[PDB]
């Protein structure tokens, strides 16, 4: 029957209380329907973004980070690239769109989508073995080991986009994390008068839905 | 008479004490996180036969570490990451009518046990190490790298007489000779890694020592038979586009 | 004496009691930066009586409330920054740094001469219930810490005295009260029968079950 | 008392007169040493007033 | 299994041999002479436990002098003058399956017993003296102040084999172990003083001696449980004008 109860005479710095209007008897300029209204920060993370898969120790320029190299000369069993899915701590995905949104939260889980698009000559053909390792599993060390697991044989000739929806993507705050590896299966074959190099670009998204809980400040830009 | 239970091995026996009135059941009874129920896991994984001698104190087996080397179940623990299972434990001893003794078969969920020396740490090989019946001892334990193992406090500091809270069945040799405890899955997270966490610990405690008269068998063999029921795991394959 | 019935034994109004859990002092001016503010990891394993009550259950789910009683001795009104760092937040290591200025840490500002400061922390945890007892290891190699998990972790309360350019030579003393609300409990457990030796371990020394009497037939 | 596990055993033997006493108890489950640290004892000691009936099974 | 009889004390047991096919019944089932039925008298007044040793001969208890010191029943005998009662006697012995013996539990109405020395008198303390199982002896008795006590003539001169006329039940240790004899009130006067007259005498006679083999209990405890049923007395208050 009182409002002088303990804990109700303070500034709690997260008040939802209403407060006096500084200047009433002032008309605001009514809102205009501007294109592209945003309702969640999750909409931002559901937009595909070029991830820098290549980011070798000695990197001459910063625009070769988005290019995974593929060449004519290279053995039939050789590894193209390796990734560790952990889009919040792994260096590859750290500064992508998906990475930035995630780092403002302390708990998150869901699925992500990885599209691999071959950007190269229109006359090249070959096959690859995009292989996926479950969270607990070790990355395969040979193409033969990789093939036993979950694998998609991506034909560069008949397709040029391979979309992989990956589940069990969680915060994990070494670590249990999935792995996506890719292996030569046939090598790149070209006819006369065609370059001897091509590249593969990679994209990442936040798939159908993700859930983020509890705000936190970014550990990027320092105060 | 004899209700012969078959699964993939046969166990002939002839009450069921359900853990808390909850039977083991799939999590599906309630894409992003698909599961893979393995329905070939159940079958009677009979453990080793301990000898109940006159001068014995008690025994305990950590679960699910007791079945870590047992067939398919053992394999799945290595392969898969997250998994949940319930268990049907049949503890049967075989004794005559000239043998007198009492046992408390109790399933204790989440029992943290203190070290023998206060303020010291001990290795994981001091609690569990495959299928072994670790032995409680009379008096104190002064071996630094061992668990406290004092029977009267049950190695937890709770008093041994009060262990009757937990789902328990008494094997009084005078009358009955079998105890069936159907333990469901009890944890605060839907499913957990089966190496890190020891879900529950089965303890068999002799409350009355065995007296066998004269020129009769000097031990009563106690056999433990565990069947993992309704075991679920995590999917290992990708979702659709 | 007569019989009747009860309703004072329900779990909610058994464990739900306001009880002191921490008391500390701090001086605004001295040569030790440790003593210029108060740190306090939230846990309910410091007050022995309170501990024993809660440990008769294995899983507990509750949202607490924390009330502070602050007094000060030596002129004008004095204000206190009562910050709450939640799990995985930045913690101040010294008085005045960017961790105090963090806007994701709920911070009360209470000035003396008013009714005590209070706030109600909700049920934080990604689990479905805090677990008093944990029978496992931090890693699956099983060489880590024993009987410790991070899902029962609660944040820290950091209290500092809001001061100008040059502080006063005042000293203050804080007392913290802690009370569960809307408690639910699952799986009961036998009471303790040994004296606690550590604030985080379950370590004990063996003790006799009960007191002795002269003879079994003798009862007076 | 030599060990602490013989506290739960009331002894009965072949040799003992036909009129002899086996055991004695005083029902007061909150102050009597026997029932002091049992489940029933522990719950009761957190209260200052209590009454009802208890059940004693002898097996 | 176990038909637990309750009255005000409990006796767990598991045929009834009625005295002559007549159950105990009130005299009212048939002012100047009012009666006062006491309905609180019945309850199991368990007597002392005799030991059936290998070298024993037999035992007898005079009724109603055996219950003269037993509770309410005992009190009423002192207070009141005239009283009549019927009795339900449960004679149970407890023995294993390695013990062999035979007993004749017989209720003999009005047994006058001759003195040890012919033409001599003996005191009332030689037949009854509260609750005591007086012992028959082998051969003659030459103690002047004792009863004849020769087992073969049953202390009455009638021959021990012919005692089967009276309501009797045989406790053969081979099979059964309990004898229930429901004795009604038999006298030639409606009700009589309970100190002067000993209504009937219960005799337990071992016809086959106990042989217990080796390293087994050397006695078989025979317990007698008597419940007085339908006991009536005389009024102690004046009539109306």
Q: How large is the share of residues in beta strands of chain A?
A: 25-35%
- By oligomeric state, this entry counts as part of a larger assembly
Largest sheet of chain A: 6 strands, antiparallel
**Fraction of residues of chain B in helices?**
under 10%
Order of helices and strands of chain B: EEEEEHEEEEEEEE
Query: In total, how many beta strands of chain A?
Result: 10
Function (chain D): Forms an icosahedral capsid of pseudo T=3 symmetry with capsid proteins VP2 and VP3. The capsid is 300 Angstroms in diameter, composed of 60 copies of each capsid protein and enclosing the viral positive strand RNA genome.
Protein name (chain D): Capsid protein VP3
Subcellular location (chain D): Virion; Host cytoplasm
Organism (chain D): Coxsackievirus A9 (strain Griggs)
Can you offer a commentary on this structure?
Chain A: This is Capsid protein VP3. Chain A: Forms an icosahedral capsid of pseudo T=3 symmetry with capsid proteins VP2 and VP3. The capsid is 300 Angstroms in diameter, composed of 60 copies of each capsid protein and enclosing the viral positive strand RNA genome. This is part of a larger assembly, with two copies of chain A, two copies of chain B (241 residues) and one copy of chain C (220 residues). Chain A is mainly β and 223 residues long. Chain A is built from three helices and ten strands, in the order H-E-E-E-H-E-E-H-E-E-E-E-E. Chain A has one domain. Helix content of chain A is 7%, strand content 32%. The longest helix of chain A has 6 residues. Chain C is mostly beta strands and 220 residues long. Chain C contains two helices and eight strands. In chain C, strands 1, 2, 5, 6 and 8 form a five-stranded antiparallel sheet that branches. A three-stranded antiparallel sheet of chain C has the order 4-3-7, with no helix packed on it. At the B-D interface, loops of B face loops of D.
């Amino acid at each position: 029957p009182t409002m002088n109860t303990p804990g109700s005479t303070q500034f709690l710095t997260s008040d939802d209380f209403q407060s006096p209007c500084a200047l009433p008897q002032f008309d605001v300029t009514p809102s205009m329907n501007i294109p592209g209204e945003v309702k969640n920060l999750m909409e931002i993370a559901e937009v595909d973004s070029v991830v820098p898969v290549n980011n070798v120790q000695d990197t001459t320029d910063q625009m070769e980070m988005f290019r995974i190299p593929v060449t004519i000369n290279a053995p039939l069993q050789q590894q193209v690239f390796g990734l560790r899915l952990q889009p919040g701590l792994d260096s590859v995905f750290k500064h992508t769109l998906l990475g930035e949104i995630l780092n403002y939260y302390a708990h998150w889980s869901g699925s992500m989508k990885l599209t691999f698009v071959f950007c190269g000559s229109a006359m090249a053909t070959g096959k690859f073995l995009i292989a996926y390792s479950p969270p607990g599993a070790n990355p395969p060390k040979t193409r033969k080991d990789a093939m036993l697991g979950t694998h998609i044989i991506w034909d560069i000739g008949l397709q040029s986009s391979c979309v992989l929806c990956v589940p069990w993507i969680s915060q994990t705050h070494y670590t249990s994390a999935g792995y996506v590896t890719c292996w030569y299966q046939t090598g790149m074959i070209v006819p006369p008068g065609t370059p001897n190099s091509s590249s593969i670009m990679c994209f990442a998204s936040a798939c159908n839905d993700f859930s983020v809980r509890m705000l936190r400040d970014t550990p990027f830009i320092s105060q | 008479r004899s209700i012969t239970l078959g699964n993939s091995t046969i166990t002939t026996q002839e009450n069921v004490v359900v853990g808390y009135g909850r039977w083991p059941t799939y999590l599906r009874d309630d894409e992003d996180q698909p599961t893979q129920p393995d329905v070939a896991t159940c079958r009677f994984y009979t453990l080793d036969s301990i000898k109940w001698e006159k001068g014995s104190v008690g025994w305990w087996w950590k679960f699910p570490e007791a079945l870590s080397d047992m067939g398919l179940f053992g394999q799945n623990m290595q392969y898969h990451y997250l998994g949940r299972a319930g268990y049907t434990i049949h503890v049967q001893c075989n004794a005559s009518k000239f043998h007198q003794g009492c046992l408390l078969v109790v399933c204790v969920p989440e029992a943290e046990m203190g070290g023998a020396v206060v303020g010291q740490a001990f290795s994981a090989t001091a609690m569990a190490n495959g299928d072994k019946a670790y032995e409680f001892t009379s008096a104190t334990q002064s071996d630094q790298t061992k668990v406290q193992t004092a029977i009267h406090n049950a190695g937890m500091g709770v008093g041994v007489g009060n262990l009757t809270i937990y789902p328990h069945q008494w094997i009084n040799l005078r009358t009955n000779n079998s105890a069936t405890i159907v333990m469901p899955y009890i944890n605060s997270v839907p499913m957990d890694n089966m190496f890190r966490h020891y879900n529950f610990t089965l303890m068999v405690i002799p409350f009355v020592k065995l007296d066998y008269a004269d020129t009769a068998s000097t031990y009563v063999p106690i056999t433990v038979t565990v069947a993992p029921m309704c075991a679920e795991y995590n999917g290992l394959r990708l979702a659709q586009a | 004496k007569n019989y009747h019935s009860r309703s004072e034994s329900t779990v909610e109004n058994f464990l739900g009691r306001s009880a002191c859990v921490y008391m500390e002092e701090y001086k605004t001016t001295d040569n030790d930066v440790n003593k210029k503010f108060v740190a306090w990891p939230i846990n309910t394993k410091q007050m022995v009586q309170m501990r024993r009550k809660l440990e008769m259950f294995t899983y507990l789910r509750f949202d607490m409330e924390v009330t502070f009683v602050i007094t000060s001795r030596q002129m004008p009104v004095l204000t206190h920054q009562i910050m709450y760092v939640p799990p995985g937040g930045p913690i101040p290591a010294k008085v005045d740094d960017y961790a105090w200025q963090t806007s994701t840490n709920p911070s009360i500002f209470w000035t003396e001469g008013n009714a005590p400061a209070r706030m109600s922390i909700p049920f934080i945890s990604i689990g479905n219930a805090y677990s008093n007892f944990y029978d496992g290891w931090s890693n699956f190699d099983q060489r880590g810490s024993y009987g410790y998990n991070t899902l029962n972790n609660l944040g820290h309360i950091y209290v500092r005295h809001v001061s100008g350019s040059s502080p006063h030579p005042i000293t203050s003393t804080i007392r913290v009260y802690f009370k569960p609300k809307h408690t639910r409990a699952w799986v009961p457990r036998p009471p303790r029968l040994c004296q606690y030796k550590k604030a985080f371990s379950v370590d004990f020394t063996p003790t006799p079950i009960t007191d002795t009497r002269k003879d079994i037939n003798t009862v007076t």
